[PDB]
Every structure is written in C-alpha cells, then in structure tokens.
Amino acid sequence: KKYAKSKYDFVARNSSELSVMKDDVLEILDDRRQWWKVRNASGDSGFVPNNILDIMRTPE
Amino acid sequence: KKYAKSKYDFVARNSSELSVMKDDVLEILDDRRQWWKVRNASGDSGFVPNNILDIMRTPE
C-alpha cells in the first residue's frame, strides 16, 4: 500500500474533501491517480480524474 | 475560468466522486488541483491536495 505524510494541515471544505492534520499519515488510494476539482453545467462541483479530459481554449 | 471536455464517461463508485458523461463540459477549479484519494487511520476516505502530501518511502 501507498503512504504519504501530511506536511501541513488541511481543512476540508466539502463532504468530499478529507480534513487532515500536519504529520498525518494517509494511505493513497486509486494508485496515486490524480484528480481535479470540477464544476459541471448543473452547478454541482466534484472530483474527476484528470486522465479523462482534454483542455479547452479560445483564442480570445 | 478553466474548461475541459470529457473524452469518456466516468461512473462515480461512491459519493465522493463526480460522475461525468462523454463530451461533458466541466469548469476547472483552480488549475493545479491534482488531488489524491486518501484514507484515514480511522477508515475515513476523501480528497486531499498532493502538494501538502509527502510520499513515504524506504530510506536509503
């Protein structure tokens, strides 16, 4: 299993965020995958893997 | 304001995840989220920003 040690304190915001403490020892789930906090058209925010998307841009 | 389109679908297993449909346009909260799914020494599970998380590893 994976293990990371919190360097600082982290106050969760939403029920999907885990509030940790400095020196807290966490277990990395989902093979260290990387997620992003997103907001859908509906409004509800959430967590989605960054793996699944392609960025968008508008040349002004 | 950041935006990205979902290349694929993503079914959220639990409740701490955001389900997304193919070709779904999502807004990017912060741009460098890069969140991991971690687990508490209490059993709790959620999302935490990796920049404050130090990977534990065997010495050398």
- A40 → chain B, closest CA residue: B26
Paired tokens of B6:
């979902």
- Give the nearest partner residue to A26 out of B27, B29, B53, using CB atoms: B53
The b-or-e profile of B35-48 (16+ CB within 10 A means b, else e) is: bbbbbeeeeebbbb
Short-list A29, A57, A11, CA closest to B28: A57
Short-list B56, B20, B14, CA closest to A50: B20
Do B37 and A44 make contact, defined as CB atoms within 8 angstroms? no
Query: How many angstroms away from the CA of A13 is the closest CA of chain B?
Result: 10
- B47 → chain A, closest CA residue: A17
Domains along the sequence of chain A with CATH: 1-60 (2.30.30.40)
Distances (CA, A) of B9 to A24, B2, B19, B23, B25: 34, 20, 8, 8, 12
- Residue of A8, A18, A58, A60 for testing the chain B interface, max B β-carbons within 10 Å: A18
Report the C-alpha gap between B50 and B30 in whole angstroms.
14
Strands B2-6, A35-39: pairing is unpaired
Resolution of the determined structure in angstroms stands at: 2.5
CB A17 within 8 A of CB A46: no
- Give the nearest partner residue to A48 out of B20, B38, B48, using CB atoms: B20
Which one-letter amino acid corresponds to residue B13? R
Number of residues that this document lists for chain A: 60
Please state the φ and ψ torsions of residue A50, each to the nearest 5 degrees. Answer: -70, -15
Q: In a 3-state reduction of DSSP, which class is residue A28?
A: strand
Do A38 and B16 make contact, defined as CB atoms within 8 angstroms? no
